[PDB]
Amino acid sequence: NLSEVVISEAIITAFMEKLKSHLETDVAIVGGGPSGLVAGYYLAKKGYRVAIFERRLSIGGGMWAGAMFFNEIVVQEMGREILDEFGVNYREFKPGYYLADAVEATTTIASKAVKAGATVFNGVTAEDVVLKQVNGQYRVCGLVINWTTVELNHLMVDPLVITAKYVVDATGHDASVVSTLQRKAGIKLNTETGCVVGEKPLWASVGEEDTVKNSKEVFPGIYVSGMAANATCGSHRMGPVFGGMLMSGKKVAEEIAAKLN
Amino acid sequence: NLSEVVISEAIITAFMEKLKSHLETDVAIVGGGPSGLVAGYYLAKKGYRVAIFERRLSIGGGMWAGAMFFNEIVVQEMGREILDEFGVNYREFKPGYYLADAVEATTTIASKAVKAGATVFNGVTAEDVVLKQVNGQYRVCGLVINWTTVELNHLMVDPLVITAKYVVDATGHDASVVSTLQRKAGIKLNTETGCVVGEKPLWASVGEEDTVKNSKEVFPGIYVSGMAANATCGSHRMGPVFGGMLMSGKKVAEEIAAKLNQ
Amino acid sequence: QNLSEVVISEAIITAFMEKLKSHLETDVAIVGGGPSGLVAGYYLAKKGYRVAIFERRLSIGGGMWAGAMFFNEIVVQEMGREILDEFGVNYREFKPGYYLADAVEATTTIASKAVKAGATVFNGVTAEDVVLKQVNGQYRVCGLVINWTTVELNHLMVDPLVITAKYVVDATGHDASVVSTLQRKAGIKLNVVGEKPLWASVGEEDTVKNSKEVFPGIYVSGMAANATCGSHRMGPVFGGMLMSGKKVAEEIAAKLNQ
Amino acid sequence: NLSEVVISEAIITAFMEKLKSHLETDVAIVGGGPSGLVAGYYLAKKGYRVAIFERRLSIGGGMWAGAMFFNEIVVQEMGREILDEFGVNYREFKPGYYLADAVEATTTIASKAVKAGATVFNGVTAEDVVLKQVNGQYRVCGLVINWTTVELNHLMVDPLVITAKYVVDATGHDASVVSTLQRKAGIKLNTETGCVVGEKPLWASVGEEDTVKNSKEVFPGIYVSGMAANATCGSHRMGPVFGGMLMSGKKVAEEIAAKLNQ
Amino acid sequence: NLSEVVISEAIITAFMEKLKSHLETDVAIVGGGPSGLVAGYYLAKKGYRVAIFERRLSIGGGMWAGAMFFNEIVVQEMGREILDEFGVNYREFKPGYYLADAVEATTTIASKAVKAGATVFNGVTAEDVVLKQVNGQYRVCGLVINWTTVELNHLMVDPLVITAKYVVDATGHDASVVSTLQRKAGIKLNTETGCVVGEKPLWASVGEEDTVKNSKEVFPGIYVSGMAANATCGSHRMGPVFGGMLMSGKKVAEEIAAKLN
Amino acid sequence: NLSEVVISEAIITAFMEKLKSHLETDVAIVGGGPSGLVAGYYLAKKGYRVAIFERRLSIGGGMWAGAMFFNEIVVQEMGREILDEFGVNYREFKPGYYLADAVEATTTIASKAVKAGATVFNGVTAEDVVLKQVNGQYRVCGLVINWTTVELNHLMVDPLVITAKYVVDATGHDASVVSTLQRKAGIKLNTETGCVVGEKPLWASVGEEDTVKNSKEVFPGIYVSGMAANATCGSHRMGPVFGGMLMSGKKVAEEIAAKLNQ
Ligand SMILES: C/C(=N\CC(=O)O)C(=O)[C@H](O)COP(=O)(O)OP(=O)(O)OC[C@H]1O[C@@H](n2cnc3c(N)ncnc32)[C@H](O)[C@@H]1O
Ligand SMILES: C/C(=N\CC(=O)O)C(=O)[C@H](O)COP(=O)(O)OP(=O)(O)OC[C@H]1O[C@@H](n2cnc3c(N)ncnc32)[C@H](O)[C@@H]1O
Ligand SMILES: C/C(=N\CC(=O)O)C(=O)[C@H](O)COP(=O)(O)OP(=O)(O)OC[C@H]1O[C@@H](n2cnc3c(N)ncnc32)[C@H](O)[C@@H]1O
Ligand SMILES: C/C(=N\CC(=O)O)C(=O)[C@H](O)COP(=O)(O)OP(=O)(O)OC[C@H]1O[C@@H](n2cnc3c(N)ncnc32)[C@H](O)[C@@H]1O
Ligand SMILES: C/C(=N\CC(=O)O)C(=O)[C@H](O)COP(=O)(O)OP(=O)(O)OC[C@H]1O[C@@H](n2cnc3c(N)ncnc32)[C@H](O)[C@@H]1O
Ligand SMILES: C/C(=N\CC(=O)O)C(=O)[C@H](O)COP(=O)(O)OP(=O)(O)OC[C@H]1O[C@@H](n2cnc3c(N)ncnc32)[C@H](O)[C@@H]1O
Ligand SMILES: [Fe+3]
Ligand SMILES: [Fe+3]
Ligand SMILES: [Fe+3]
Ligand SMILES: [Fe+3]
Ligand SMILES: [Fe+3]
Ligand SMILES: [Fe+3]
């Protein structure tokens, strides 16, 4: 009736066509938090080929838990309009403050992002970042990837190499991909200074306005996004308001779409 | 421009409301894996007040990773119609076998269940049931819940309690809730031995057949579905095919739905 | 200032030694400074018995600090309400029969009166075993085998010291650590079945009924009593925790007047 | 008779209102040791609204254990008068040296501080400050809080934010709050340098001297008390003598109470 | 000059043809210790299709370290003739006692086994064992496999299913595959009793003679081998003499080859 | 039939002999990865007394798992001839690119190196060098070795010492031996900074080119090869292509071989 082997063969064949397929993508996003997912949504909407490389088996990052396990997220008016196209239900709590359910937003955003074409590879840690000289200087043009698993158990397993036109570090507070660039290649970042400055303490107002503005190309071929943008640029954090996180992924997507012409 | 205080007010206030309004529910489901989520969808879609208590911050259980991190999940025709009530796109590989992306399927089923009214509490462990004499019967009457971090770190933190009319143990392989029921209370389960028998080795054809059959009331007030059904009744596991797990959830919600219109 | 480091060290050492040596023989040795153990030690010391409490944590209070799920509130019903009044714990009637208390104020106030009342606390100290001596023709618990908690955690080859008591109180909570041990290592029999799932009404009746001398010389109090007399727990209602501690203290004080 | 869902809802309701009514506070104390509790008592005595955020499930910091598990604390004359304001029994060892039972000192100070209105939240780590440019000046205006377990287990759970007119670092040797303030802001503190200098070795005379003197506003909006003050300003540690910790706490409360009438 | 992607594509394509290939093997050996490797050698020599599933990234099991890190192994006369076809150098220490270098024997055995055709999948834990009814009763006819990694980090990752005509539990002291059969299916083993009896304390003489004799089909479709044979049958261990381990893998191979007709 | 005593005698006696006869060697190689093994082969094949000290019980380094547990290793034409001195079978995938099974290649290279006379000590950490003044020069003169379990468990166990005429740091990415050389002794290495520079991000064409170039003497008496060469000199890593690593080992053995016929 039901062959164990057709099933293994099917799982094996599909994943590995899928991974051969994305050995070249236009945009490789690192981190499947909100900003990573929203960026990959819009880029997959505009038709580009988008891979998302997520350290944990699940996507969603720090949105699942809300604040202190109280799984309600807040967005202001900027980002409320992003809860709209993904279709996230929200009611108004006070003028300019829109509550949503943390689980609903995360799964709906993530479902629409993968349905738009963005491939997800979960369990995969972006380890380092391919940089070569292409007509002139050093340019980031790919990712070094391994199983998260391998990383933390400290196993001598060699990585695989994904190549891309643009990398988005949507990796959260730790900004680990641009940190790793910065540290291993010795370069300078477009941050003034030329380093991962480290995120400043909390101020919701300045914090979110800066997240949108910090979402830029800090080195040729690599964009920060979401909370890595505030870590890289040395701006304030904003607590559990997620409007700036969603907005950031949209900004990095349309801007990368702009250069992709 | 923004009051950090207002964001904090709104989160504390909202979650407080969500928790209070589910201290008494029709159906408390334990575990947001494939089968637990589908049961919550259909139970909500039929208009019942449902809460889901999930140990990890992210729902989806063993289904994120397809098999061996190879992001694909196979279903056969049985769960292939379940994949259409949710809008999970798929292709077939060979006749009768279907492939969906594991992440799309997990998040899509997840989204539509919580949109139907399934209220998800993540980072919450169900650690015991409420066991209480009804008309001359011990009956599972609800759950004893704590934060997962309290169990993990062995912190002396007392749990809270919710009441439900039915509890669904959908905790996977662990069969976690019924296992606790049997040892702390010395009751018997509707199984060959009276106990959680434990799953047998792999046989995909019998395993998927026995999952919908074992998804049943095993003691007054509590169902098992999913891998927990096979683990409780002593049937074969099936491997990375998810048609049983999805069908399991629909079957249990319909049976509990019927029982609720007595 | 003129603070001799030598004098501060000598004081701390001299005082603790003499406190420690003066409780090598106590009337009642209580294991566990959670709610029942502290309340039992208050009521016994207020009656003028030498009570020693042995708490594995550096802090007392056990599981009362967190209320439920870190939500710092204690709910007490009829019985525990009037014990709160014995200790001076403020409260507030949510609905008739239910009284809310600050979980931190209850713990620290109960702890404070218990130790002011004469009950001596030894924190950081794990009761590891009991002393079984034959007395009057039967085996009987006659005190404790104690070590540093930190020797148990890091698995260190360090011997215990021995406390002598007329009665021992296992107020260890869900673990029923002392009677489980006695039972496991002697091949005795008690009156440890393990607790049952939650039924808070039988749970708070069953905690006071079950706080009894389950083997010569050793009472069980509080949650330890329910786990031993395999009954139902109760959740974040603390009334029977407070009442059983007073109950055990009355029983023990009565048997000690003979 | 005993309805567990009435119990559950009273706890969920009181606590989450206790938390909302301290999203706004006059003074947020981080650290429920002897210094942080004493400042909390004297501020609450004077009627100001006070929250104390405590990392462990219990308060008491390092006073529980005396020195080397020997449960005795030594105070001199300056601690001696503070023990009498609390009703802590003591005995005189050699002239000008008083020893109290360390369990009695910790639980009594704690009890009276909380009876006077100091609200305490356990299992809650202050992990960062709110920094706001107030009239052209960067000022500490609150705390970023999370559950302790979330930091231990490295969970991706966002914080809640409270707001305060004054923050007291009373985190003992670690000087946790002012330490993260400096490295993440890059600011400078009222010392010779910035950040925390780190404590010197031991010299009880100078160590106790300097605790009283270093309990200061080291940056607008945040004070340091107790050993965080010695650590921040780089003075000597005193041994297991707690006179300076208690007096440190009382100084910071009277100083902050002054500034709260301006 | 040198494309990062042809390299990833090559590693991806080859492994996954290789794993599609062995979704059916004649014999799936669990454990790449000496007995597992010697069995797969001879079965691959006789032309059968042999997969080896090894929990650790390296093969060799407990042979690498010799005894107490003193990396010299001993074989008696039985097994000396097995050091011959693999070509392991050995000098005679005393009549009937042949020393070999632990690293040399392990790598040479393992190289000749993989060169004979035995495929190795390392990092792969055999988790459970497919049993179905095939004309009559329950028969072991495959393996449930996952990444070792997954197992120990306790990650909810589903396994894959390999199907085979015969399974060899060459898994060492722990006999984990037949233990897992025995415990999950409730069956009885051909051991008298019907359980993993557990290995007896040490006696070199009886221990090694029993290893050869205990290497049998303890349940339809599954063979023990090497040190799992002594664990399953309740016989003595033999210390760091490895002659019986090598002999056992040969016996299980020619006997399984016999039934494969 | 058998004397357990005789087996134990023969193991203790044999290993004792093997250890003693290598307390003084021509070349002590640290690390039995791809590049370390190939260098030991060619150095033995040319008749020099070689010892290899490998931290783990199994040689082979990062090469067992090909890439991401996908058991295949790519080499280009450069290491494609190296694969023939050992008899590692391969196919080509696209022109100039070759695939060998990672397990066959690892064990085959390993077998032939130890058969050529390379004596392998596994479970042994090189933790320091011997540094000793020769004709008016500090020169690496040998190694300080301990059991890996002593380092892992932080046991107070003193090491032993071997002497060699050349030490080859082939410890992969860690560049473990030269890193210790630089910090404990304050020497400089033949590199841009004088220090272990650290590897740069990935560039497979330059990475493999720079590996044979950086496989050189970096301080009197010690070479680097393999990934340690790239890590010490600050070049690009290359990913899962092993032609540099094999060529690296042959180059270093030839250079050390020449230097040894001064
Ligand atoms: C608003 C806020 N903080 C404000 C405040 O604290 O005041 C938050 O914390 C938000 O969650 C931040 O949103 P954002 O999308 O920027 O990040 P996230 O949710 O933390 O997602 C990051 C993702 O990136 C993953 N990740 C990490 N590092 C790697 C790696 N090398 N390779 C692959 N993935 C990696 C990681 O698993 C995670 O899922
Ligand atoms: C097909 C298959 N196996 C076949 C095979 O192996 O051969 C699978 O693994 C499927 O994923 C099984 O799906 P199913 O929905 O039955 O279970 P799951 O995916 O493992 O999810 C169960 C959920 O329950 C959670 N959970 C556990 N215990 C508790 C607890 N006390 N309280 C709250 N939640 C808990 C747990 O985190 C998990 O998320
Ligand atoms: C009502 C309720 N639960 C209902 C429910 O969950 O459904 C509770 O949990 C209450 O907090 C229980 O109150 P109770 O006083 O019975 O127990 P507790 O708070 O856990 O205190 C036990 C004390 O005993 C300590 N302890 C443990 N074992 C030893 C040992 N061998 N030696 C010395 N001390 C030990 C331990 O650290 C602790 O302080
Ligand atoms: C006299 C002496 N030392 C002298 C010497 O060693 O020679 C002492 O140890 C005294 O006990 C010092 O008393 P003091 O009140 O200054 O500090 P403490 O007892 O150590 O308590 C600080 C409290 O602060 C808590 N805490 C820490 N960090 C955080 C954080 N980020 N957030 C929330 N709470 C936190 C922490 O759990 C602790 O309870
Ligand atoms: C002679 C002796 N002892 C005598 C004495 O002590 O007196 C020995 O220890 C010999 O090494 C035994 O040789 P043998 O080939 O029988 O076993 P081994 O060397 O221990 O190899 C077992 C292999 O099996 C592996 N393994 C384990 N369990 C699993 C699993 N579920 N799935 C996949 N692989 C697994 C494991 O990694 C290992 O490599
Ligand atoms: C191609 C590639 N990377 C490219 C990329 O990532 O992009 C690789 O990983 C290759 O495997 C590198 O081969 P190479 O022979 O250079 O190094 P390796 O395989 O990692 O082996 C080094 C050996 O050295 C061992 N070792 C470490 N440190 C010590 C120590 N102090 N003492 C004794 N041995 C030690 C260690 O166990 C290991 O076995
Ligand atoms: Fe590498
Ligand atoms: Fe409890
Ligand atoms: Fe002893
Ligand atoms: Fe955050
Ligand atoms: Fe499963
Ligand atoms: Fe030394």
TrEMBL record, chains B, D, F:
Fe(3+) binds at residues 158, 173. Keywords: Iron, Metal-binding, NAD, Thiamine biosynthesis, Transferase. Its cofactor is Fe(2+). GO terms for biological process: thiamine biosynthetic process; thiamine diphosphate biosynthetic process; thiazole biosynthetic process. SUPFAM superfamilies: FAD/NAD(P)-binding domain. Coiled coil: none annotated. Glycine binds at residue 237. One of its GO terms (molecular function) is pentosyltransferase activity. Fe cation binds at residues 158, 173. Pathway: Cofactor biosynthesis; thiamine diphosphate biosynthesis. The keyword Plastid does not apply. Transmembrane segments: none annotated. Its EC number is 2.4.2.59. It catalyses: hydrogen sulfide + glycine + NAD(+) = ADP-5-ethyl-4-methylthiazole-2-carboxylate + nicotinamide + 3 H2O + H(+). NAD(+) binds at residues 35, 54-55, 62, 158, 176, 227. It is an enzyme of class 2 (transferase). Homooctamer; tetramer of dimers. HAMAP family: Thi4. NCBIfam families: sulfide-dependent adenosine diphosphate thiazole synthase (TIGR00292). Involved in the biosynthesis of the thiazole moiety of thiamine. Catalyzes the conversion of NAD and glycine to adenosine diphosphate 5-(2-hydroxyethyl)-4-methylthiazole-2-carboxylate (ADT), an adenylated thiazole intermediate, using free sulfide as a source of sulfur. Belongs to the THI4 family. This is Thiamine thiazole synthase. It comes from Thermovibrio ammonificans (strain DSM 15698 / JCM 12110 / HB-1).
